[PDB]
Amino acid sequence: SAFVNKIFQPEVAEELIVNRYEKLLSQRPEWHAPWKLSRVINGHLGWVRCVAIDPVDNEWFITGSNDTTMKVWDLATGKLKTTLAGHVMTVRDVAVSDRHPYLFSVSEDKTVKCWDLEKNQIIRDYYGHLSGVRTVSIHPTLDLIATAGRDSVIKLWDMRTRIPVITLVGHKGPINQVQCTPVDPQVVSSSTDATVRLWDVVAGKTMKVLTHHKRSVRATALHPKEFSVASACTDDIRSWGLAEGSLLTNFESEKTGIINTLSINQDDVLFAGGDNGVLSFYDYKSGHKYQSLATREMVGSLEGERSVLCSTFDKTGLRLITGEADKSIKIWKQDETATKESEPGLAWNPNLSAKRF
Amino acid sequence: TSHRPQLEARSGAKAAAYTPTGIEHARLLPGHTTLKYRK
Amino acid sequence: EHPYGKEVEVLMETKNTQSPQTPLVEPVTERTKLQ
Amino acid sequence: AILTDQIAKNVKLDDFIPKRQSNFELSVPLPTKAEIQECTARTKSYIQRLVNAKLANSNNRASSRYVAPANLLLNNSHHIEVVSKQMDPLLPRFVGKKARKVVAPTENDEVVPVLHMDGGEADPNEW
Amino acid sequence: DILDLEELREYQRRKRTEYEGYLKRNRLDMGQWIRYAQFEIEQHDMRRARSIFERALLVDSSFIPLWIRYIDAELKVKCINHARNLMNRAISTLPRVDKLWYKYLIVEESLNNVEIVRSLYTKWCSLEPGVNAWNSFVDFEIRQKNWNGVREIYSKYVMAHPQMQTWLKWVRFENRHGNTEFTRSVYSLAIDTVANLQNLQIWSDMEVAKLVNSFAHWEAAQQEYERSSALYQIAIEKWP
Amino acid sequence: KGGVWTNVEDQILKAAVQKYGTHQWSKVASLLQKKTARQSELRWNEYLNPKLNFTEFSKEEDAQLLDLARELPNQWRTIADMMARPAQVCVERYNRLLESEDSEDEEKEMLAEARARLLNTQGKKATRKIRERMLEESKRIAELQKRRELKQAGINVAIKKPKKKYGTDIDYNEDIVYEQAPMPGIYDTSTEDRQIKKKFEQFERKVNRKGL
Amino acid sequence: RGGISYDQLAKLSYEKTLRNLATQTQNSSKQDKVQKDTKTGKITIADDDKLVNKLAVSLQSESKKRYEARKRQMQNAKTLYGVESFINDKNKQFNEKLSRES
Amino acid sequence: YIGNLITRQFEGRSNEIVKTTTKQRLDAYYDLELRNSVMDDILEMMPESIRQKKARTILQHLSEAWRCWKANIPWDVPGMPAPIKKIIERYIKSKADAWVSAAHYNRERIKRGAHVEKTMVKKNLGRLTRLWIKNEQERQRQIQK
Amino acid sequence: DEINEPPPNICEQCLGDEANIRMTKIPQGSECKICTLPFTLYHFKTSKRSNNIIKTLICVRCATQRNICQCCMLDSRWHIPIQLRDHLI
Numbered sequence A: 001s002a003f004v005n006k007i008f009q010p011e012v013a014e015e016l017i018v019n020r021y022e023k024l025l026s027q028r029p030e031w032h033a034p035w036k037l038s039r040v041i042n043g044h045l046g047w048v049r050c051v052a053i054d055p056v057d058n059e060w061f062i063t064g065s066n067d068t069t070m071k072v073w074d075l076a077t078g079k080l081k082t083t084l085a086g087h088v089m090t091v092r093d094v095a096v097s098d099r100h101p102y103l104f105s106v107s108e109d110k111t112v113k114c115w116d117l118e119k120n121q122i123i124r125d126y127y128g129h130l131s132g133v134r135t136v137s138i139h140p141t142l143d144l145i146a147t148a149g150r151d152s153v154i155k156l157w158d159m160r161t162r163i164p165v166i167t168l169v170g171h172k173g174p175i176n177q178v179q180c181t182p183v184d185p186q187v188v189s190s191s192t193d194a195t196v197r198l199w200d201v202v203a204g205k206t207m208k209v210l211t212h213h214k215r216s217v218r219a220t221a222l223h224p225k226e227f228s229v230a231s232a233c234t235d236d237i238r239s240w241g242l243a244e245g246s247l248l249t250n251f252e253s254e255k256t257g258i259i260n261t262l263s264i265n266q267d268d269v270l271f272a273g274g275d276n277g278v279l280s281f282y283d284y285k286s287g288h289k290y291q292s293l294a295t296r297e298m299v300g301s302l303e304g305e306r307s308v309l310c311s312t313f314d315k316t317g318l319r320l321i322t323g324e325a326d327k328s329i330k331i332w333k334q335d336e337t338a339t340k341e342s343e344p345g346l347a348w349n350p351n352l353s354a355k356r357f
Numbered sequence B: 001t002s003h004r005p006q007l008e009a010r011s012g013a014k015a016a017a018y019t020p021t022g023i024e025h026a027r028l029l030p031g032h033t034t035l036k037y038r039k
Numbered sequence C: 001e002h003p004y005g006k007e008v009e010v011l012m013e014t015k016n017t018q019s020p021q022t023p024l025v026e027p028v029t030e031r032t033k034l035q
Numbered sequence D: 001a002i003l004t005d006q007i008a009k010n011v012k013l014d015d016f017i018p019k020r021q022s023n024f025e026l027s028v029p030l031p032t033k034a035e036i037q038e039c040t041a042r043t044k045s046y047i048q049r050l051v052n053a054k055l056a057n058s059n060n061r062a063s064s065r066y067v068a069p070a071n072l073l074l075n076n077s078h079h080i081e082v083v084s085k086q087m088d089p090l091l092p093r094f095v096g097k098k099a100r101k102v103v104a105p106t107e108n109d110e111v112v113p114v115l116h117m118d119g120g121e122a123d124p125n126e127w
Numbered sequence E: 001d002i003l004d005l006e007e008l009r010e011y012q013r014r015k016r017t018e019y020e021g022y023l024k025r026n027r028l029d030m031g032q033w034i035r036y037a038q039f040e041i042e043q044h045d046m047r048r049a050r051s052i053f054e055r056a057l058l059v060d061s062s063f064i065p066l067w068i069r070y071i072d073a074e075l076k077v078k079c080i081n082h083a084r085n086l087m088n089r090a091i092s093t094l095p096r097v098d099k100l101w102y103k104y105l106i107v108e109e110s111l112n113n114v115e116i117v118r119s120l121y122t123k124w125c126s127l128e129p130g131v132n133a134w135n136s137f138v139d140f141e142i143r144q145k146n147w148n149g150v151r152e153i154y155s156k157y158v159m160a161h162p163q164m165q166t167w168l169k170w171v172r173f174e175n176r177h178g179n180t181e182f183t184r185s186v187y188s189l190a191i192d193t194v195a196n197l198q199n200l201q202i203w204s205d206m207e208v209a210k211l212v213n214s215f216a217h218w219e220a221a222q223q224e225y226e227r228s229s230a231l232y233q234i235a236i237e238k239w240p
Numbered sequence F: 001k002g003g004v005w006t007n008v009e010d011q012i013l014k015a016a017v018q019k020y021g022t023h024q025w026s027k028v029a030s031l032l033q034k035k036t037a038r039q040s041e042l043r044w045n046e047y048l049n050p051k052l053n054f055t056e057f058s059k060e061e062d063a064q065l066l067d068l069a070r071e072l073p074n075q076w077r078t079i080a081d082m083m084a085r086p087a088q089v090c091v092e093r094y095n096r097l098l099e100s101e102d103s104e105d106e107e108k109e110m111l112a113e114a115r116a117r118l119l120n121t122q123g124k125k126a127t128r129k130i131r132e133r134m135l136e137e138s139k140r141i142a143e144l145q146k147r148r149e150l151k152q153a154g155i156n157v158a159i160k161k162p163k164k165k166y167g168t169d170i171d172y173n174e175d176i177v178y179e180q181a182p183m184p185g186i187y188d189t190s191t192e193d194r195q196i197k198k199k200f201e202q203f204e205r206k207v208n209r210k211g212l
Numbered sequence G: 001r002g003g004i005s006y007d008q009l010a011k012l013s014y015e016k017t018l019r020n021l022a023t024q025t026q027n028s029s030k031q032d033k034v035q036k037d038t039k040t041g042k043i044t045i046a047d048d049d050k051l052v053n054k055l056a057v058s059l060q061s062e063s064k065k066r067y068e069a070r071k072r073q074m075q076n077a078k079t080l081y082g083v084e085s086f087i088n089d090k091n092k093q094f095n096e097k098l099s100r101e102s
Numbered sequence H: 001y002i003g004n005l006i007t008r009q010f011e012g013r014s015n016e017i018v019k020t021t022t023k024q025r026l027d028a029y030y031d032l033e034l035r036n037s038v039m040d041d042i043l044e045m046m047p048e049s050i051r052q053k054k055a056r057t058i059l060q061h062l063s064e065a066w067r068c069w070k071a072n073i074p075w076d077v078p079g080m081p082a083p084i085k086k087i088i089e090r091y092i093k094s095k096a097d098a099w100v101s102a103a104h105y106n107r108e109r110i111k112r113g114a115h116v117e118k119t120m121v122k123k124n125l126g127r128l129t130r131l132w133i134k135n136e137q138e139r140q141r142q143i144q145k
Numbered sequence I: 001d002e003i004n005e006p007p008p009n010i011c012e013q014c015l016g017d018e019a020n021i022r023m024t025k026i027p028q029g030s031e032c033k034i035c036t037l038p039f040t041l042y043h044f045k046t047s048k049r050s051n052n053i054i055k056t057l058i059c060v061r062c063a064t065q066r067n068i069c070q071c072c073m074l075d076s077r078w079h080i081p082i083q084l085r086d087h088l089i
């Protein structure tokens, strides 16, 4: 209060451990309705490693997998539409274009492929990664696909001419996740050297390096509104303000260990898939873990198989498609007829002992 | 010895500072030269 | 054996319900053609 | 307190602290429609100039299908016309171009502070 | 053994071809970097010997034995201003690491530069590092007898770590010196802040009992039993 | 022709399994002159194995063996897994338990060959590399001694450099090959560099006189 | 029991050298600035050359002492155990490493 | 064809040759991605103080346990930490699915008779006889239980 | 950057007295004398009727690091050789 400022006379009056803590108790998080399992889909011969939703009209999603084949699943009924084979090794990331009928998919077989979704064939193969390619993001409005992998550089691919146009060299380890934003910084990347880079693609250099995580930043996710990115190390999840490189918030992720995937809803629901199945939903603007679920594997499988590997919401934001190690695709529904009363979620309780805030 | 695992992969930082050659590959020939735009 | 508590719908899929030749995005044909 | 600034100038306490913790309703705005077009057209022109560099430098004749003088020197004491030489199509264009290997130095002017948090550090022999 | 300078010049080529060969195959293996960097110190060419440590820091700058050995290499050859720049880059890159901060301190302790460790500690305690830094910073001023300065630290130390073992450490400081006017001022500040900041819920029931008892048993030794007795009533009412 | 197991062949077999593990039997029997890999594998799994217990049965184990032998008559490999005993032990006791109701020098040569083979872990690339380095050092020492003798005769001949194996091959001695300078800091290392240059030139001045 | 973390080990190494610096001043007492060049930007600190010498000697002395305290540990542990079969020194240091696991 | 030849004469070969994955180097590249994935997940589990030495020894247990799964020997390490043992058993079963499904897929090729390499016949011969005896050993234990 | 490159550093006394000079740019001409790495060879003549082509012998990166022109490799200010420049300082 004012007695803190008049006796322990500060120089900032915000950089005190108490004044930060009392404003956290001063504010309440937005309530969100919890999430429940609604459909389990068993269709792959291996792990599901990446899920992409149809960005236009939301009919279907596609799950690239460990059995080297992508399968197209209908969202509503859950039925299997078609199977897209054409890699020889494990498909790591799949991303669909919104302006194009094009599907880009990168495996660990060092190949970046495009797919004519009017024809369901492989067209326009890309070439040049020295090692397995982890991730792809289609740049919005610019006609570039950003691919990155164990190579440790991001190669900016022109679509039409298949040219490694811009190579982004800043990292020290394998890049786990890459994102594309419409303005500068146009490429957001995260690697195993515990850094998150903000790339000025014209100059080819880094605008800002975010060295706040301890261990390999395994997953990032862009917020569909409000222009921010949220990156996950093994212990902590930090939302980042783009165009300043500012640390917006630290989430209340404690004792979660290894966060494999992230996805942000329009309704400020951040999903954090853990390798220990323990899947958690965080308020985005605050950082409150308001729900923490655990999954059931199958009739028979190992205990390690309980692990979420990849996740995204649909276009409406009311469905959550997660792919797990137990060869399953789990659809998570946010249940209706839940109110702030009788479903409060976990209690908003920040502490001093964790230095997170 | 002489048969080892990898401690780190070959980085693309090294090949970026090289000078290019401009050899002409069969798969880099012009093909599918027109992009299709969604409605 | 009735797993996930019967609220959840579990489905095993082994075959594609579409032909592979089915496009997967309808090509936009604006002008009607009679050729 | 004779040298207060000089020690570790690049790291501040402000970089550790979040900004949403003061107000959860801080607005981080989306980029405006006039802002994305100013950045798209700058980037698209830069990319198309790079692609036209790659296609023109390739020795394929079928790559011009898919695609500055009078500079001032000596504080404009001389106006110099810059022209291109008509290349012989048989002699190798870019006579200095070889396939050589170059190791690059690292330009380290400012140190990046590795900004972890402090320290749940007690551990038995379980690992 | 080497006789003349030309035999030395051929000896140095054979080892440097050898070590640069194993470092070309292995960018990693930080121990191999240090043994070649130690080789160049033995050849008395410190310009080369600075270069291997700089090249090894470009591979893994988070490896703490590499930082300490290159700092010690600058200290053993009496290049003190090369070490001040180097430890400055050590704490500016890795501010979390406690070893790199201590390393700056005990060198400037060894040079009797008391105003540089004081300027170093003011910066280090501004980044809120933990209780090992502050407790070594209050132990620093006890060495320097700056009693007015160490009292300013505990004013900041209770604001960085609000907990009774930092408040009761400050009353163990004052009751070590026997100044009665200063001790009850700290005691009055400690018990008001628990009352002022009751709603924040950061001191537990067992934790506030240590403050009330150590206030009362000190007032019992100061022969004022009526202040020992009355505070028990206000604390039980203030916290029922 | 089928040989019997001496205590020398057993102790070679113990050390070889200690060297090679239990899944490389033809490599184990290569040390045993007169002994098949099928024999030495069977000898380990039946006799030598320290997991096996060659103990007398308890009073419970005798009744529990007679119980099994009516359950599974007669399936001795199955019983021996239940009894956790070797199978011939289970048979030979069971026959005795029904009878309760009554009414050098060639060996020392192959030992020395086995002792030599066990203590050699290098292989052909390593052993050739050890020899090639010993030659290369000896070629160096002779060339240095040759120069020292010509220096006694007053003729100064310089050391030949190793020739460039490829085009951009690097003489590490001529220059600092990847000089990464220390980053410029604020503490003005001016007089310290003078003391190094004085000391470094002093050290090379002492090499020209005292050597080392 | 258990191990000591690096932040705790760095403090104890910090405290030990202060006691070496305390007794060094006590053994000495028993026997008997800042200039900032504005043009270059550089800061120059004038300090006693004896204390720079005593800093340089003590680090070499601590380096040799740990070098010798480990060298005797190399010579002792080579001549302690000879029961289990070995081949070379790297086999001996590995099978001893198996003993500390159990 | 000649335009590449002549520029190779004048300029030399590019030093940036990146080998695509092929039928001959698929099994090696499958192992490089597998050791990297196991290395990354175990190193996150580790609280602190793990270097190039400790990451080198833990990748042995993975190689040993894959041999044990092929042998049908149960793989138990005494004193192994249960999170790491949970990780290693997971990736084996990942590799087991690729090991088994490639064995099924190549038998369907051999029965059709459609272009199986001479080495691949012997490899598939060896993969089945692991699976047949493994199925045999499972059936022996189910009768015993 | 291959599409954003500095203008060449040439002396005034290499260019000479005339006003307008027709200079020929070859984008990867010869390789540098110093760093042995290719560059944009500029070459020109002082007058139209001259009989000596004046080439740029070094790249602009080697010309900037020494602060010399590319043609005669004398210092841009003081117009003296490098060995005499570093001796006077």
Ligand SMILES: [Zn+2]
Binding pocket: I032, I033, I034, I035, I036, I037, I058, I059, I060, I061, I062, I063
């Ligand atoms: Zn040059």
Ligand SMILES: [Zn+2]
Binding pocket: I010, I011, I012, I013, I014, I069, I070, I071, I072, I073, I074
């Ligand atoms: Zn000139």
